[PDB]
Amino acid sequence: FSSVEADRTVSVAVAGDASSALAFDTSDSNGNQYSDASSITNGTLELAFDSLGNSSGINLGAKTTFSPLFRTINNGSNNVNLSIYSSEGTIQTSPTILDSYNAVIENTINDGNGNSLTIEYAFTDENDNSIVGDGTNGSSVSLDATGGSDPNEEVSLVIGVADPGSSFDPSTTISGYLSEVTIVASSV
Amino acid sequence: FSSVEADRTVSVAVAGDASSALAFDTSDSNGNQYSDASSITNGTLELAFDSLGNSSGINLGAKTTFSPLFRTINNGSNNVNLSIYSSEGTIQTSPTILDSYNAVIENTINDGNGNSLTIEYAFTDENDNSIVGDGTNGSSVSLDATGGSDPNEEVSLVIGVADPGSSFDPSTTISGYLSEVTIVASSV
Amino acid sequence: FSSVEADRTVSVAVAGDASSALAFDTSDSNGNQYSDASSITNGTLELAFDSLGNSSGINLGAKTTFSPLFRTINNGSNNVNLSIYSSEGTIQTSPTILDSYNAVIENTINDGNGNSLTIEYAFTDENDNSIVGDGTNGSSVSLDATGGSDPNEEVSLVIGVADPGSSFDPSTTISGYLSEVTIVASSV
Numbered sequence: 001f002s003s004v005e006a007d008r009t010v011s012v013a014v015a016g017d018a019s020s021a022l023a024f025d026t027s028d029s030n031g032n033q034y035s036d037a038s039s040i041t042n043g044t045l046e047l048a049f050d051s052l053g054n055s056s057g058i059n060l061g062a063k064t065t066f067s068p069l070f071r072t073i074n075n076g077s078n079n080v081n082l083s084i085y086s087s088e089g090t091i092q093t094s095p096t097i098l099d100s101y102n103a104v105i106e107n108t109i110n111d112g113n114g115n116s117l118t119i120e121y122a123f124t125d126e127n128d129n130s131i132v133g134d135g136t137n138g139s140s141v142s143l144d145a146t147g148g149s150d151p152n153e154e155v156s157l158v159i160g161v162a163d164p165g166s167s168f169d170p171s172t173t174i175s176g177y178l179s180e181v182t183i184v185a186s187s188v
Numbered sequence: 189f190s191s192v193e194a195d196r197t198v199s200v201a202v203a204g205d206a207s208s209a210l211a212f213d214t215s216d217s218n219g220n221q222y223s224d225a226s227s228i229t230n231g232t233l234e235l236a237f238d239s240l241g242n243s244s245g246i247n248l249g250a251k252t253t254f255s256p257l258f259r260t261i262n263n264g265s266n267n268v269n270l271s272i273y274s275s276e277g278t279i280q281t282s283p284t285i286l287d288s289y290n291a292v293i294e295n296t297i298n299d300g301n302g303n304s305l306t307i308e309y310a311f312t313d314e315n316d317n318s319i320v321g322d323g324t325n326g327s328s329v330s331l332d333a334t335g336g337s338d339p340n341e342e343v344s345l346v347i348g349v350a351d352p353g354s355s356f357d358p359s360t361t362i363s364g365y366l367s368e369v370t371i372v373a374s375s376v
Numbered sequence: 377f378s379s380v381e382a383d384r385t386v387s388v389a390v391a392g393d394a395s396s397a398l399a400f401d402t403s404d405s406n407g408n409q410y411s412d413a414s415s416i417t418n419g420t421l422e423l424a425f426d427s428l429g430n431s432s433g434i435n436l437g438a439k440t441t442f443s444p445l446f447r448t449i450n451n452g453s454n455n456v457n458l459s460i461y462s463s464e465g466t467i468q469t470s471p472t473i474l475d476s477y478n479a480v481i482e483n484t485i486n487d488g489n490g491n492s493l494t495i496e497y498a499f500t501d502e503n504d505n506s507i508v509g510d511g512t513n514g515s516s517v518s519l520d521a522t523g524g525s526d527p528n529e530e531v532s533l534v535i536g537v538a539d540p541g542s543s544f545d546p547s548t549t550i551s552g553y554l555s556e557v558t559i560v561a562s563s564v
């Protein structure tokens with residue numbers, strides 16, 4: 001009624017690695033690292049497939065499948081549909097190289113004195129389901145809310161690369177690959 | 189006219205939670221309540237993003253949108269422009285992390301052996317419009333007077349936090365965050 | 377001179393609302409009532425914040441400021457200084473909650489199984505001066521009588537209440553608040 005009101009107060013906190021509302025751990029107690037393909041976050045989760053040592057990244061002209069990779073944690077106030085839609089790349093359905101799974105993240109680049117090289121990505125999760133984000137249909141998996149009993153996420157990955165016998169070479173420049181694989185855990 | 193007149197009497201009452209000239213409540217229905225992000229006021233309403241059960245706060249380098257959050261109730265005999273702005277932070281326009289909305293409440297913090305980390309807050313109301321208080325222009329929404337027919341108000345929220353490149357770490361100290369989120373429901 | 381005289385007769389007329397030497401009014405033609413915070417005098421003028429409707433009083437921890445409230449009307453001869461010294465309450469300077477203002481009327485109350493809650497008042501009118509009573513210095517404003525030009529008076533009000541996070545609870549009894557806000561219009 002014609003007045004101001006200043007009774008509010010707030011407390012906030014930030015946790016980058018293992019205590020956010022939606023976190024990622026990538027390790028097992030008294031066990032092993034799930035895989036060093038992805039490393040413990042430095043304050044931001046990172047994927048390092050493009051370089052391993054004793055191998056200059058992915059092997060061309062074949063299918064490279066990666067182990068469970070990083071797990072996920074949810075503690076928000078609602079059940080969530082975790083999904084990955086990879087803003088930088090492009091959503092593709094009915095894959096051209098990884099023709100088994102339903103939908104994928106597509107990327108393509110060229111040499112510079114050579115032309116298209118085609119690559120494809122898919123995150124397979126629990127029953128090999130391709131978790132490929134939210135789109136016209138996208139793809140997602142169910143999760144438990146704050147507490148609950150059972151989160152069920154160990155998001156595996158598959159990398160597919162074409163095999164051009166010409167119009168491409170594995171030497172010299174290759175333009176930038178994908179980055180910024182966004183994650184969504186919206187409500188349902 | 190050269191005389192005193194003790195002609196007056198007055199009655200005053202105080203109520204902090206659900207019955208006042210301007211009230212904030214969570215009284216949806218026989219079915220549900222509006223999320224755990226802001227518990228019922230203890231005498232003064234409080235925002236509790238500091239912790240969500242297992243989680244110690246918010247994700248870095250990501251956008252954390254939140255549910256409708258607390259509602260607002262007006263009971264004064266005037267259509268009032270409800271608005272929100274923190275006296276501890278500062279008003280910013282054309283957000284650096286939340287670049288969709290028009291304006292935000294900007295806050296920043298640092299590690300102590302690591303320098304700035306940036307963060308922004310936006311309250312979106314019943315239609316995703318950013319309420320950011322009263323300023324040179326600010327932002328506000330309409331309301332109904334005493335009784336009226338439709339207070340038709342609920343204040344949504346979004347939290348955006350920048351990503352730390354190599355100049356900040358969650359480890360060790362993080363200086364104080366925002367507090368005292370004031371509110372204005374002045375006369376239009 | 378050893379005798380008595382009885383040449384006496386002079387009438388007395390009483391009117392509780394408008395025709396008195398000092399009076400109060402609340403509305404004007406073809407327009408609006410100033411506000412229902414103080415309804416028209418029933419023979420005595422009352423302040424009714426306790427029952428604003430759809431509310432149980434004033435918000436805690438807020439600078440509850442109200443509309444211009446009642447005006448003041450004079451029909452006497454001499455210019456007067458108008459002030460409110462609130463016999464029941466206490467006079468305080470350098471307010472503790474409404475700190476910007478000069479002087480205030482102070483009151484405090486408790487729970488019975490809980491302790492002090494602090495509240496404060498002040499009127500503004502022209503100059504926004506407290507107009508709080510006559511005391512060691514008090515606070516007053518000038519007013520004209522028998523027309524001439526006009527009284528040019530309208531006494532607004534502000535209500536401040538503290539924000540105790542403990543030692544108090546809205547629940548259960550809150551002992552009596554202020555009453556008898558006395559008014560003085562004295563000679564100068």
